[PDB]
Structure 1
Amino acid sequence: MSRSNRQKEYKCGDLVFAKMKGYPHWPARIDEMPEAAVKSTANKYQVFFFGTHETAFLGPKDLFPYEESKEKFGKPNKRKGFSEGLWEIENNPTVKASGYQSSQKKSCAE
């Protein structure tokens, strides 16, 4: 069966663009791979949207090579905050994180 011989794959730390309905490709990066077959996650991933530092789940069909689409998707937008992402993806692709839990058993400061 010859049905378009193409099988791409992304990994944590990879710089890609995520397409959303009503919005243009937003500069993003991979933060985690798919579990296996749990919850309502067919083949999505946790991508980080620079500028706003927001995260969401999208499939590979909605993800594209940043460097490759940088010139096409790397341009200011009316949604505001888009440009801010351009600077981050270039100046700091590892900006922001998942978050840490301060004080679990006891606290000292507050």
Structure 2
Amino acid sequence: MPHAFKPGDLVFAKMKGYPHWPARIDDIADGAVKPPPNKYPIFFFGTHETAFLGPKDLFPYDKSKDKYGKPNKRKGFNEGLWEIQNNPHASYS
């Protein structure tokens, strides 16, 4: 059975006006800005941007890849696909 989301989990993350986007749940660095309550820090592969999202917007990668894991015209997207498949836990600072 599923657990709660935890740092390191791989997802497709959905934001308004964007396709479901390869992403991960990030850690919060010591001394760094925490998310609001019930929100997770989401790191988007390819663009390397962070947003704060709740579970409604988070689709587990394994389950969802056959649907969402296809090339897209949007900037950063196909780079994002490579990252999530090839080095999803790397530092992208």
TM-score range, shorter-chain basis?
0.7 to 0.9
Q: Is 2:58 the counterpart of 1:63?
A: yes
TM-score normalised to the size of structure 2? 0.81
Look up the SS of the partner of 1:95 in the other structure.
coil
Distance 2:40 2:58 in 1: 10
Counterpart residue number, 2:75: 80
Counterpart-to-counterpart distance in 1, 2:59 and 2:80: 16
Q: Which has the higher contact order (CA 8 A, sep 6+)?
A: 2
Give the root-mean-square deviation of aligned CA atoms.
Answer: 2.1
Give the residue type in structure 2 aligned to 1:14: D
TM-score, scaled relative to structure 1: 0.70
User: Structure 2: any 5+ residue segments left out of the alignment?
Assistant: 29-33
Match for 2:36 among 21, 32, 41?
41
Aligned residues: 87
Runs of 4+ in 1 over 3 A off after TM superposition: none
Aligned equivalents of 2:51, 2:35: Cα separation in 1: 14
Contact persistence 1:20–1:62 (CA under 8 A) = yes
**Identical aligned residues as a percent:** 74
Q: Where does 1:1-110 land on structure 2 (aligned, <5 Å)?
A: 9-32=4-27, 41-97=36-92
3-state SS, counterpart of residue 19 of structure 2: strand
1:32: how far off?
A: 3.1
Segments of structure 1 that go 5 or more residues without pairing to the other structure are: 1-6, 34-38, 100-110
Radius of gyration: which is bigger? 1
